[PDB]
Design a protein around this ligand. Sequence first.
Ligand SMILES: CC(C)S[C@@H]1O[C@H](CO)[C@H](O)[C@H](O)[C@H]1O
Ligand SMILES: CC(C)S[C@@H]1O[C@H](CO)[C@H](O)[C@H](O)[C@H]1O
Ligand code: NA
Ligand code: NA
Ligand code: NA
Ligand code: NA
Lengths: 211, 211
Amino acid sequence: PNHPLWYTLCDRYGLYVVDEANIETHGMVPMNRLTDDPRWLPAMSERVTRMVQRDRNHPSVIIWSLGNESGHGANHDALYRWIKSVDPSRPVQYEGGGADTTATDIICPMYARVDEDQPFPAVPKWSIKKWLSLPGETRPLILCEYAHAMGNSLGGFAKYWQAFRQYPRLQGGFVWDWVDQSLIKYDENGNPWSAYGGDFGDTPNDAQFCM
Amino acid sequence: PNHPLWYTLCDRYGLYVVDEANIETHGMVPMNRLTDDPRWLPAMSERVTRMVQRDRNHPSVIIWSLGNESGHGANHDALYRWIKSVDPSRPVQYEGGGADTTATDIICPMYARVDEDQPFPAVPKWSIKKWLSLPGETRPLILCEYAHAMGNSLGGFAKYWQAFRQYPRLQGGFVWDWVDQSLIKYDENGNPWSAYGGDFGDTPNDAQFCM
Ligand SMILES: CC(C)S[C@@H]1O[C@H](CO)[C@H](O)[C@H](O)[C@H]1O
Ligand SMILES: CC(C)S[C@@H]1O[C@H](CO)[C@H](O)[C@H](O)[C@H]1O
Ligand code: NA
Ligand code: NA
Ligand code: NA
Ligand code: NA
């Protein structure tokens, strides 16, 4: 959840918002080790329930998200249903565990390509055009993350938009991401420079991936 | 419906057969002027019902077709249901009126392209990949006619098969078509040669489109 003023501005300037719970357990092995553990349901529930209690009156928020990269656990299904029950005015989405689980109203993959499939075991990233028509699938598809803008990037961006415009159910996505997470440091001449992972003695680190 | 021996051979050699009623009113304006006319329901019913009564015991026949290029009329819906009722063991298909009407269990367009949409009024031919995922659509797609092999042709044939293999619901199609409808004529020297439309004084005619 963001600083409270953010929603006020989106309400007034006009931007659709996906409000997301502060829940990410990416480094766990497997990714859903905590989210499928009932012992952690309480902690997770508050991160979801208290967000809804705080932001449910903001018109800018149109979709609720159960968090990010935490695999797919039984706790997600429980909280998915809690939200659907308490606030039926907004769809609920969550990408963990394959982007099309029982815990999401929207197929919301991250970095699924336009025409090329990436058949990873258990959690494949199908071509988005293909994903829509898989047997029995009927939901809209909006990428929660796509077009990783790291450095000299965004090659192939037009291919996504051509598909978005051609396929009714391909309803867009959220580019990753808005601003480089570089930090200011100062050299001997007191000149400020942009720093990334590892520049503060932090280790281990993932260097420029924060930009 | 074909010569009776054809079904015998298909049963024994092994070929899936689409048995089609002898009904085509392509030349009408609009194309469904007769098929939507109840006065013509009797004549049409016999062409469908008598076909089913004759070939319903052939295992090679796996799909029934209500005919060809006769637009979409109420008579089609009536006969679609008649077949569904008397023989639930075989899906019923029909391309007329848009290839995805209420008279077909299979999206069976003719010459719909792989990636390119052909937004014709009332009866558009959508890209086959796009067709499968249109809002609310769930049926399989098998082209009743594609890759018009007229003369030096079949360019782009590989594009269809790549799509067929990638998309579960794109289950193939029927190339148009098997053999040139050329007829033999003889010159002054008694030497035989292949003739087409117009070579018999027949006029008006459509020349080489029979091949
Ligand atoms: C396979 C790893 C790179 S995971 C990858 O790292 C990215 C770095 O910007 C983002 O955080 C993505 O959301 C994450 O899935
Ligand atoms: C005249 C075309 C626009 S209609 C086209 O003609 C073809 C000729 O081989 C086939 O008969 C197709 O089935 C028919 O739709
Ligand atoms: Na779209
Ligand atoms: Na990053
Ligand atoms: Na297929
Ligand atoms: Na022809």
